[PDB]
Amino acid sequence: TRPNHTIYINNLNEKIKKDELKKSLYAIFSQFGQILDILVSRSLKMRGQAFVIFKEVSSATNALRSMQGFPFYDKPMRIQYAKTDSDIIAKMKGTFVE
RNA sequence: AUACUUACCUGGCAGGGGAGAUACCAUGAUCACGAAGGUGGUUUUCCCAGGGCGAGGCUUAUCCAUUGCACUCCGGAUGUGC
Numbered sequence: 001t002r003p004n005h006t007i008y009i010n011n012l013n014e015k016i017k018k019d020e021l022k023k024s025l026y027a028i029f030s031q032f033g034q035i036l037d038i039l040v041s042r043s044l045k046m047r048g049q050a051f052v053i054f055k056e057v058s059s060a061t062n063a064l065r066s067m068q069g070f071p072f073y074d075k076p077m078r079i080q081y082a083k084t085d086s087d088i089i090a091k092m093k094g095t096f097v098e
Numbered sequence: 099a100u101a102c103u104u105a106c107c108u109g110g111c112a113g114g115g116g117a118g119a120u121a122c123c124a125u126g127a128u129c130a131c132g133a134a135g136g137u138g139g140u141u142u143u144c145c146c147a148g149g150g151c152g153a154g155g156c157u158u159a160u161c162c163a164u165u166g167c168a169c170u171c172c173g174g175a176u177g178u179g180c
Contacts, residue, residue: 010165037169044173045166078165087169 003057005089006082007064010049013073018042025050032066033059036088053086 012021018040025038029052039051054060064079071077090096 006167008167010167014164039169041168043166043168044164046168047164047166047173049166049168051168080167083167 002081003061004081004085005055005057005060006051006053006086007060008049008051008080008082009067009077010080011075011078012048012050013075014042014048016073021050025052028067028072029063032063037086039086051082051086053089 009025016024022038022040025040026035029035029038032054034055036053036055038053040049041047052060052063054063060081064081067077068079069076085093085095087096
């Protein structure tokens with residue numbers, strides 16, 4: 001709930017393959033700012049979710065505001081802030097601890 | 099039912115993966131203790147020459163469950179071709 005460099009997106013159609021989904025997520029989410037990375041996994045816990053890491057929290061917040069509910073493969077997108085900083089964020093800040 | 103002598107009718111020979119290394123067995127080698135090699139084994143490296151074990155791994159659909167906060171690949175089962 002507290003703004004973050006990374007946004008977390010879930011409730012995605014699970015049929016889409018990892019590389020396809022990363023590609024289309026990059027395409028969809030670049031409109032709001034420079035994206036450093038999009039992390040997707042299809043494991044049991046992680047399937048259906050992606051982390052988009054933006055350079056600025058303001059871009060993250062605006063992407064959340066705009067895309068909240070966006071029709072995506074016949075499903076409304078659910079977006080939250082990441083609970084924790086993404087490793088590449090934490091290393092740029094020097095906050096990272098194993 | 100068997101063997102013996104004769105006539106007639108049928109029919110192609112050799113074999114059992116191959117090349118190296120064998121200190122050890124057999125051949126108990128015809129000259130005052132002896133062969134080597136070779137031949138037939140046992141041991142030991144390969145072109146892998148065919149098979150058995152299908153663990154592991156690759157490609158893609160079906161079924162069940164998951165709303166999951168990860169950043170060292172990886173949910174369970176069935177089918178097709180390797």
